[PDB]
Amino acid sequence: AESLELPKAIQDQLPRLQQLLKTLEEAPPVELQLLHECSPSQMDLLCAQLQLPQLSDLGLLRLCTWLLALSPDLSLSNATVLTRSLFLGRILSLTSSASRLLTTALTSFAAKYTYPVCSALLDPVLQAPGTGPAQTELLCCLVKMESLEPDAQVLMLGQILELPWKEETFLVLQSLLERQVEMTPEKFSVLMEKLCKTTSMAYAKLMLTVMTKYQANITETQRLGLAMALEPNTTFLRKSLKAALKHLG
């Protein structure tokens, strides 16, 4: 309805692409190489017309294998678009842990496109209503990947801090913070402000990780802020948190 046009070669080769995808459900052909004709907006349109969200798990894994062999590499933004089209709907639809094939497809694609996969799925997954352990376990796994390099971890931390904070975010953030990711004092200030401003075990563990792994960054005002956030007897991990707090004094 928005009338964006696919690149000429793509419009022309489109039944061939639909053909190839069907075979995957039954080394990449040059037709897949045509993905490079697309801007990311065109890639989004193309993915929808290919009906990528509707591939079987097997078709998905096979297509990911082909995508991983593409040379040159997909650009950051094109890889971001493809990731969402390939995986977002499937992940959001989970009511149980991801199948072996889904997990294999996602992790092998992320092993190469680590930052693009993580940045592509983090926001929409966390911002979706009713996101649960089946969704957060995959996000936790992504952010723990050894191939998510130190600078990409810094970038993901910045992205997580900008999200509204609820239990699912606490889990993913704690997983990333366990890796000892560096933060500018400005980012650390945001983290502390949100932390100091609760009933869950996930919030307790997040708090504990921050107080123990980032002790060197905690200012006296932040310490007092933590002190206030801890007073009540309703909180989880009271004893460990009090101990961690006393250590900062």
CA 117 to CA 76: how far, in whole Å? 9
Structure determined by: X-ray
Q: Which of 180, 183, 182, 173 is nearest to 140 (CA)?
A: 173
Angle, helices 150-161/185-196, rounded to nearest 10 degrees = 40
- Can you give the three-state secondary structure of the chain, one letter per residue? CCCCCCCHHHHHHHHHHHHHHHHHHCCCCHHHHHHHHCCHHHHHHHHHHHCHHHCCHHHHHHHHHHHHHCCCCCCHHHHHHHHHHHHHHHHHHCCCCCCHHHHHHHHHHHHHCHHHHHHHHHHHHHHCCCCCHHHHHHHHHHHHCCCCCHHHHHHHHHHHHCCCCCHHHHHHHHHHHCCCCCCCHHHHHHHHHHHHCCCCHHHHHHHHHHHHHCHHHCCHHHHHHHHHHHCCCCCCCHHHHHHHHHHHC
Q: Two tokens at 140? A: 């936790």
Asked if 32 and 21 touch (Cβ cutoff 8 Å), the reply is no
**Could you give all domains of the chain from N- to C-terminal order, each with its CATH number?**
1-249 (1.25.40.480)
